[PDB]
Design a protein around this ligand. Sequence first.
Ligand SMILES: [Mg+2]
Length: 319
Amino acid sequence: MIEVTFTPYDVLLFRESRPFDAGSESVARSIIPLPQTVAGAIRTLLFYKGLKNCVGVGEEEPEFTLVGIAIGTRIYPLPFNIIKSEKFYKVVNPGRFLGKLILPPKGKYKSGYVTESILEKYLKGELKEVEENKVIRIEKEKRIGIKLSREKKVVEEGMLYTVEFLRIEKIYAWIEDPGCGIKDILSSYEFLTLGGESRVAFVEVDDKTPDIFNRELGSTKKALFYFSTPTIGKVGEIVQELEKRLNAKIDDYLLVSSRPTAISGWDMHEKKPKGTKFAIPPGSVLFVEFKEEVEVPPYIKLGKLKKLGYGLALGGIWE
DNA sequence: CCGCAAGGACCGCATACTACAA
Ligand SMILES: [Mg+2]
């Protein structure tokens, strides 16, 4: 597995799906980067390097597989079963009622990010709570710009716009290369355009598997699956897929989640927006009670568009 | 020829203290 590290020179824009044309709708608000955007940046580099075989021009997916992405300062969205109570974010474990897994009422969820070490303790079921100071928020930087007339140096009519950028220190991407020679091509490049407004990020590439993908969790009936990237597909099909890949049937499951992630994007091949897809948002947790004990995998890919970085679930246990 | 050999008042007050288009 190859590990790509993107270091933004300054700011990044991963624009939400909304009109953003000069002289009209003029507000661009960034979201947390979707893995397909990172995949697109890599595919575009290969598209220009002449490796159009691995790109998948006009195709939904490339030949290579983007395992997933993570932002860094490496941090992850607070699991949705972690609820803020006073100055602490408390882990809420599944309960049972009428023979069904439920999450007991303990307050509303508040968004935020935690370090990889805090997530690791969570996945091992050893995390009780997190002090509110260790819960990170992503910094935004709002910039307001204009367009000037060529000669008179005054603002052209209606040419004012606003961008809410993200201030991100690092983005990590992991790629499985079936022999396209991506590691060599990425090594030849120092930087690439990532997201909107022609912002660039420095590129480093190392041949390594992150330790979080190599954890030994043991065997249990009570496994959980933390989605680190958006996961596309019906919950039923995802659970069924999970049953097949682990060769074990499920007694019951509970999806703790939030607002669905709206995913469209821009088709650079056809020069028009991509079709809207809906996904289980990062930070969502699928609690599963298998009928038999399973060896909980450190990570597992689920749902549609796996090669674009979607459906990266991190294994964990609960009691 | 000798001696003395500064002191307090005031102590920045007021007004203006964004306007407008692109
Ligand atoms: Mg632009």
